[PDB]
Amino acid sequence: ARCCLVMPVPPFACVKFCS
């Protein structure tokens, strides 16, 4: 899938993945 909403704070990873 593709990142839907990434967080600028650590973890900088994505919070919600878009299907």
Coordinates of N, CA, C and O in Angstrom, one line a residue:
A1 N 0.8 -1.2 0.0 CA 0.0 0.0 0.0 C 0.9 1.3 0.0 O 2.1 1.2 0.0
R2 N 0.2 2.4 0.0 CA 0.9 3.7 0.0 C 0.6 4.5 1.3 O -0.6 4.5 1.7
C3 N 1.5 5.2 1.8 CA 1.3 6.0 3.0 C 0.2 7.0 2.8 O 0.1 7.7 1.7
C4 N -0.7 7.1 3.8 CA -1.9 8.0 3.7 C -1.7 9.2 4.6 O -2.0 10.3 4.2
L5 N -1.1 9.0 5.7 CA -0.8 10.1 6.7 C 0.5 9.9 7.4 O 0.5 9.0 8.3
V6 N 1.5 10.7 7.1 CA 2.8 10.5 7.8 C 2.9 11.6 8.9 O 2.4 12.7 8.8
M7 N 3.6 11.2 10.0 CA 3.8 12.1 11.1 C 5.3 12.7 11.1 O 6.2 11.9 11.0
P8 N 5.4 14.0 11.3 CA 6.7 14.7 11.3 C 7.5 14.4 12.5 O 8.7 14.7 12.6
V9 N 6.8 13.7 13.5 CA 7.5 13.4 14.8 C 7.9 11.9 14.8 O 7.2 11.0 14.1
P10 N 8.9 11.5 15.5 CA 9.4 10.2 15.6 C 8.4 9.3 16.4 O 8.0 9.6 17.5
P11 N 8.1 8.1 15.9 CA 8.6 7.7 14.6 C 8.1 8.5 13.4 O 6.9 8.7 13.3
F12 N 8.9 8.9 12.5 CA 8.5 9.7 11.4 C 7.8 8.9 10.4 O 7.2 9.4 9.4
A13 N 7.7 7.6 10.7 CA 7.0 6.6 9.8 C 5.6 7.1 9.6 O 5.1 8.1 10.1
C14 N 4.8 6.3 8.8 CA 3.4 6.6 8.5 C 2.5 6.1 9.6 O 2.8 5.1 10.3
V15 N 1.4 6.8 9.8 CA 0.4 6.4 10.9 C -0.8 5.6 10.2 O -1.3 4.7 10.8
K16 N -1.2 6.0 9.1 CA -2.3 5.4 8.4 C -1.9 5.1 6.9 O -1.5 5.9 6.1
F17 N -2.0 3.8 6.6 CA -1.7 3.3 5.2 C -3.0 3.3 4.4 O -4.0 2.8 4.7
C18 N -2.8 3.9 3.2 CA -4.0 3.9 2.2 C -4.0 2.7 1.3 O -3.0 2.4 0.7
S19 N -5.1 2.1 1.3 CA -5.3 0.9 0.4 C -5.5 1.2 -1.0 O -6.6 1.6 -1.5

